[PDB]
């Protein structure tokens, strides 16, 4: 197993397509910086 990521409060937006049970693969987009 299990990896948990913490990002700082206003610094990052999660890819709006991702949800519980989305397949993840190393190097695919996960979050994009704010503004």
């Amino acid at each position: 197993x299990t990896v948990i990521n913490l990002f700082a409060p206003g610094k990052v937006n999660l890819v709006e397509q991702l949800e519980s049970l989305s397949v993840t693969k190393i190097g695919q987009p996960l979050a994009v910086s704010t503004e």
Binding site: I4, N5, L6, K25, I26, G27, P29
Partner: protein, 255 residues
């Protein structure tokens, strides 16, 4: 059938989770020729492990089961995203929960939260970096690739080893074991990044309990039963440790 999922939960409570972990890790580290190839192959079809993504697709190339477990992937098959404003996934698997840390509480399952400060072994200073922050939780199943990579460029600042239990992390225990991830043994990683402070927390499970980082090697075992903290300078100071988006930072292994 709530009889059978409570049967499993009962086993979580009773079976000696640590001894099974060592036993599995003792066997996984024995170079036992044809017998380790037999286990890898049974493992490969039961879990439908895709050997075609492995550098070494031949299950005969692996001297121990652990070496199979942490098998390198083919350089071609995980292209990093090139956008420097985009954070990429650190690990293969499926998303368990992600979203907004709602004032220090992280979502574990429907009707189960856990606190930033519990997840972080009581470090309230570090927990303050992430209040109302953002979290992502990824499950690596036995099938997946078991190294984990940086989601972006970062400078290592802190690493915390936390003793803990060895509950099985799956979607049944996640919905029933309170504080699963703040209880299980885990290694905390704090980095400086162009997006601010960031944590990559590797938390063990039953059998898959060994944890290593690319900069320190195997952290557990041994299980010395105490909290250890390591610190590193800020960057462009002698001793600073830097890692690029998509670089290998650590992995999970049996035992």
């Amino acid at each position: 059938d709530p009889m059978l999922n409570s049967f499993k939960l009962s086993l979580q409570y009773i079976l000696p989770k640590l001894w099974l972990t060592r036993l599995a890790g003792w066997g996984a580290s024995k170079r036992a020729g044809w017998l380790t190839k037999l286990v890898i192959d049974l493992f490969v079809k039961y879990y439908k492990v895709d050997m075609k993504e492995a550098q070494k697709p031949d299950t005969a190339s692996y001297r121990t089961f652990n070496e199979f477990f942490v098998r390198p992937l083919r350089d071609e098959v995980r292209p990093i995203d090139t956008d420097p404003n985009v954070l990429v996934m650190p690990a293969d698997g499926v998303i368990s929960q992600l979203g907004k840390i709602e004032e220090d509480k992280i979502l574990q399952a429907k009707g189960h939260n856990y606190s930033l400060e519990a997840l972080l072994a009581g470090n309230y200073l570090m927990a303050d970096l992430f209040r109302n922050g953002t979290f992502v939780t990824t499950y690596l199943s036995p099938r997946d690739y078991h190294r984990v990579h940086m989601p972006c460029n970062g400078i290592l600042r802190e690493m915390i080893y936390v003793p803990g239990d060895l509950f099985s992390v799956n979607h049944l225990t996640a919905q029933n074991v309170p504080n699963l991830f703040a209880r299980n043994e885990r290694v905390i990683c704090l980095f400086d990044t162009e997006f601010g402070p960031m944590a990559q927390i590797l938390v063990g499970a039953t059998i898959v309990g060994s944890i290593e980082t690319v900069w320190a090697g195997t952290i557990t075992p041994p299980r010395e039963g105490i909290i250890k903290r390591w610190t590193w300078p800020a960057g462009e100071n002698d001793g600073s440790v830097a890692l690029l988006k998509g670089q290998e930072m650590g992995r999970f292994k049996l035992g």
